[PDB]
Amino acid sequence: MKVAVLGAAGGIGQALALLLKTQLPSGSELSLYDIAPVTPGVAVDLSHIPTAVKIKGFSGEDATPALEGADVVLISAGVARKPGMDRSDLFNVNAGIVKNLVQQVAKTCPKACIGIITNPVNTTVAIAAEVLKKAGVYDKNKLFGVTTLDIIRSNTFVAELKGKQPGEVEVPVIGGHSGVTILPLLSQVPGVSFTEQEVADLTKRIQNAGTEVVEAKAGGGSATLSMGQAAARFGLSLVRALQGEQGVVECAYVEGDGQYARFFSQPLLLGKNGVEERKSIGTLSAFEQNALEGMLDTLKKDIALGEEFVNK
Amino acid sequence: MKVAVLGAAGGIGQALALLLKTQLPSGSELSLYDIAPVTPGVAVDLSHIPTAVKIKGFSGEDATPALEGADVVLISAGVRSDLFNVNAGIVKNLVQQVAKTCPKACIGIITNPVNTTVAIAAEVLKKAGVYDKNKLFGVTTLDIIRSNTFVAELKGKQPGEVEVPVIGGHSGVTILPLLSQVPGVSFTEQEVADLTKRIQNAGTEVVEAKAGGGSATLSMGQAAARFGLSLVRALQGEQGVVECAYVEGDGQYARFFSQPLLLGKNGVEERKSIGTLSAFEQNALEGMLDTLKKDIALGEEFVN
């Protein structure tokens, strides 16, 4: 299988590429692409690690050589924080980058599975889908918003609270990937219960966890290493499914049946063609039902913004 | 076991901390230190990964809180004559903090130029009265993993199964891959000269391909993680853990010299023979001695 990382020179992209060079199955190929001129040197640095994963890097404006033959494209390009740029400015920069890179995908490797890491995922996945539909190549089973950082953060905070081994906790997290749209289903964690205060407190922590890192970095950066790790979990899961492994399940933000919104994160069985089955969210507690209903207005507006970005 | 990374905010340090957060044994502790103000948040970013390694990060001038109870300290801190002096002074400072807070730790020096910075570390520890030659290592593992990669590619081998001993020092002609000792593979004279040149210049290869954006960081993080995980395995009592590293040994060639080491509960358990060298390797070893000895002297003079 061949994986392309678009945005490979950034902090997320370098962490993701290091993890993929060391954990992709033997005989995989990895390409790195970013406008930054350092990118071929990022790939040469990684090529010195003795795993059976061939790696090459590419720069300039044209991602084609990285995309040729790609089975999975992970798009982590964009900016989290830049001097002088406020939320709207960052959104327009990231939206523009996603629109450009997904158009390159649609041209070169339109049958690849695509994982959008670039934030804000609630909107950038809708931009990606609109670009793909315009190209006439959209497959709703092959476009994912990578929401895995919310899952691994939830696993960490629940294992700390509940006195569990961190690698043994798995929290389902549904909805979207920002603020009140992130819905950790603490009611479905087996073996334990939470008080209403613990649910409110953990949900708030999970929904604001990105700030927690910005703050400790004295405003000097944002979550990059954990995002790299989260993206590698999702990329390696998709690779295993694409190679034929069965029973691989991950939550991700995908276009679904529209019960709640056009795009929605829910547990997915993955298979050889991307999503194999969109699994039910299961039973919700009263707090979860209310938080779900409460955020749908916001999530639907996020989605609409991506649609309107691509045309206007 | 507790591992401290000093220089954690840098490219090497962040890559190394990511690998250690995910690969240290359950129940381990990892502390990150760097004067960069970002450091405490580099640890918070990593603390969101759900593995049973507790992580904390520290900034400011005092590495004490990171070094308390540390069993292994990996020093990747740094950043032509002014560049050397800055990096030398950073190693001299950090090794002095190690000598004060965790003098019984195993110390891996990653900061370049290793051939010289290990000598600076040794003289600092000697001046503090806590120098243990079994516990101070120059981390040369990047040369080993590069040699493995390049041999595996040339000879069509599984790269994870190839293990090339590399001896000498960690820069240019002082890097000596013992290609003659790789089981199940044979090399022409041309291949030996070409592989040796590529290994010796691999650091430049990366710098060149990075076009201004710096040197090897991600593969150096992997190399240092391999070496630090081997030290932890040995400290915990695992048998048969062998790694090449630059250490103060018998002085047959130079005061410090990288050779295969059996690791154990107290750092080096045994310094192993370099074994039989081919004629090409013997002439490469003889040819590097004056350079290596000058590198060592530069570090000694820097402290003394």
- Please tell me what DSSP assigns to residue B184: T
Q: Name residues whose C-beta falls within 8 Å of residue A73's C-beta, 6 or more positions apart in sequence.
A: A3, A4, A5, A6, A67, A105, A109, A112, A113, A114, A115
Query: How many Cβ atoms are within 10 Å of A34's Cβ, its own excluded?
Result: 26
Instruction: Indicate if B195 and B112 belong to the same structural domain.
Output: no
Rounded (10°) angle between helices B141-155 and B218-235 = 110
How far apart, in whole angstroms, are the C-alpha atoms of residue B149 and residue A55?
Answer: 12
The beta strand positions in chain A, using DSSP E, are 2-6, 28-33, 53-58, 72-75, 113-116, 143-145, 173-175, 182-184, 249-255, 263-271, 274-278
Residue B9 Cα distances to B45, B89, B162, angstroms? 12, 18, 32
Residue from the list A14, A216, A225 with its beta carbon closest to the beta carbon of B218: A14
- Enumerate the residues of chain A whose CB falls inside 8 A of the CB of residue B28: none
Nearest residue in B to A165, CA atom: B52
Tell me how many degrees the CA angle A220-A47-B230 measures, rounded to the nearest 5: 80
Would you state the structure tokens that stand for residue A54, as one six-digit string? 């061939």
Instruction: Indicate if A142 and A279 belong to the same structural domain.
Output: no
Would you state the structure tokens that stand for residue B274, as one six-digit string? 């370099």
How far apart, in whole angstroms, are the C-alpha atoms of residue A285 and residue A291?
Answer: 10
Q: Name residues whose C-beta falls within 8 Å of residue B189's C-beta, 6 or more positions apart in sequence.
A: B280
Nearest residue in B to A218, CA atom: B38
Instruction: Indicate if B13 and B126 belong to the same structural domain.
Output: yes
Q: Which residues of A are annotated as a binding site?
A: 7-13, 34, 81, 87, 94, 117-119, 153, 227
Inspect the interface and report whether the beta carbons of A36 and B213 lie closer than 8 Å.
yes
Instruction: Indicate if A176 and A136 belong to the same structural domain.
Output: no
Quick one: which of A311, A4, A253 has its CA closest to A123?
A253
- Enumerate the residues of chain B whose CB falls inside 8 A of the CB of residue A43: 209
Q: How far apart are the first and last CA of chain B?
A: 34
Residue B250 Cα distances to B105, B130, B133, B247, angstroms? 22, 20, 11, 10
Inspect the interface and report whether the beta carbons of A226 and B46 lie closer than 8 Å.
yes
**Inter-residue contact A73 to A105 (CB < 8 Å):** yes
Instruction: Indicate if A179 and A84 belong to the same structural domain.
Output: no
Q: Name residues whose C-beta falls within 8 Å of residue A107's C-beta, 6 or more positions apart in sequence.
A: A64, A135
CA distance A71 to chain B (A): 24
Q: How far apart are the first and last CA of chain A?
A: 36
- Enumerate the residues of chain A whose CB falls inside 8 A of the CB of residue B36: 220
Q: Which of A93, A122, A146 is the last residue of a domain?
A: A146
Residue from the list A42, A52, A226 with its beta carbon closest to the beta carbon of B159: A52
Inspect the interface and report whether the beta carbons of B212 and A37 lie closer than 8 Å.
yes
**Inter-residue contact B74 to B50 (CB < 8 Å):** no
- Enumerate the residues of chain B whose CB falls inside 8 A of the CB of residue A226: 45-46, 48-49
Instruction: Indicate if B9 and B119 belong to the same structural domain.
Output: yes
Bond from prior residue into B37 cis (ω within 30 degrees of 0)? no
HEC string for B129-149: CCCCCCCEEECCHHHHHHHHH
- Enumerate the residues of chain B whose CB falls inside 8 A of the CB of residue A220: 36-38, 41
| CB neighbour burial string for A95-109, b if at least 16 within 10 angstroms, e if fewer | bebbbbbbbbbbebb
Inspect the interface and report whether the beta carbons of B210 and A38 lie closer than 8 Å.
yes
Instruction: Give resolution, Å, one decimal.
Output: 1.5
Inspect the interface and report whether the beta carbons of A50 and B210 lie closer than 8 Å.
no
How far apart, in whole angstroms, are the C-alpha atoms of residue A278 and residue A283?
Answer: 15
**Inter-residue contact A172 to A281 (CB < 8 Å):** yes
Residue from the list B45, B50, B217 with its beta carbon closest to the beta carbon of A167: B50
Quick one: which of B73, B195, B61 has its CA closest to B132?
B73
Residue from the list B38, B48, B206 with its beta carbon closest to the beta carbon of A45: B206
Any idea which residue has 């990022």 for tokens?
A42
Nearest residue in A to B57, CA atom: A216
Instruction: Indicate if B183 and B68 belong to the same structural domain.
Output: no
HEC string for B214-245: CCCCHHHHHHHHHHHHHHHHHHCCCCCCEEEE
For residue A133, the enclosing domain spans 1-146
- Enumerate the residues of chain B whose CB falls inside 8 A of the CB of residue A18: 15, 18-19, 218, 221-222
On the CB side of A183, CA atoms within 13 Å amount to 30
Quick one: which of B296, B114, B287 has its CA closest to B196?
B287
The beta strand positions in chain B, using DSSP E, are 2-6, 28-33, 53-58, 72-75, 106-109, 136-138, 166-168, 175-177, 242-248, 256-264, 267-271
Tell me how many degrees the CA angle B82-B83-B88 measures, rounded to the nearest 5: 100
Report the sign of the C-alpha dihedral through residues A210, A215, A221, A226, in that order: negative
Residues facing residue A274 across a β-bridge: A271
Instruction: Indicate if A56 and A156 belong to the same structural domain.
Output: no
Cα Rg of chain A, angstroms: 19
How far apart, in whole angstroms, are the C-alpha atoms of residue B83 and residue B207?
Answer: 16
- CATH number of the domain at B194, please: 3.90.110.10
Residue from the list A21, A213, A218 with its beta carbon closest to the beta carbon of B45: A213
Instruction: Indicate if A22 and A50 belong to the same structural domain.
Output: yes
Q: Which of A121, A146, A171 is the last residue of a domain?
A: A146
Inspect the interface and report whether the beta carbons of A38 and B14 lie closer than 8 Å.
no
How far apart, in whole angstroms, are the C-alpha atoms of residue A19 and residue A24?
Answer: 8
- CATH number of the domain at A4, please: 3.40.50.720
Helix (H) or strand (E) holding B68: none
CA distance A177 to chain B (A): 16
Instruction: Indicate if A81 and A208 belong to the same structural domain.
Output: no
Inspect the interface and report whether the beta carbons of A37 and B213 lie closer than 8 Å.
yes
Q: Which residues of A are annotated as a binding site for substrate?
A: 81, 87, 119, 153
- Domains in chain A, number: 2
Instruction: Indicate if B158 and B116 belong to the same structural domain.
Output: no
How far apart, in whole angstroms, are the C-alpha atoms of residue A33 and residue A56?
Answer: 9
Residues facing residue B2 across a β-bridge: B29
Tallying the residues shown for chain A, one arrives at 312
So which residues of B are the catalytic ones? 170
Inspect the interface and report whether the beta carbons of B211 and A14 lie closer than 8 Å.
no
Q: Which of A131, A146, A161 is the last residue of a domain?
A: A146
Instruction: Indicate if B106 and B149 belong to the same structural domain.
Output: no
Exposed, middle or buried, B183 (CB in 10 Å: 0-12/13-18/19+)?
Answer: exposed
Helix (H) or strand (E) holding B198: helix B189-209
Any idea which residue has 């061949």 for tokens?
A2
Query: How many Cβ atoms are within 10 Å of B114's Cβ, its own excluded?
Result: 29
| φ, ψ (nearest 5 deg) of residue B215 | -120, -170
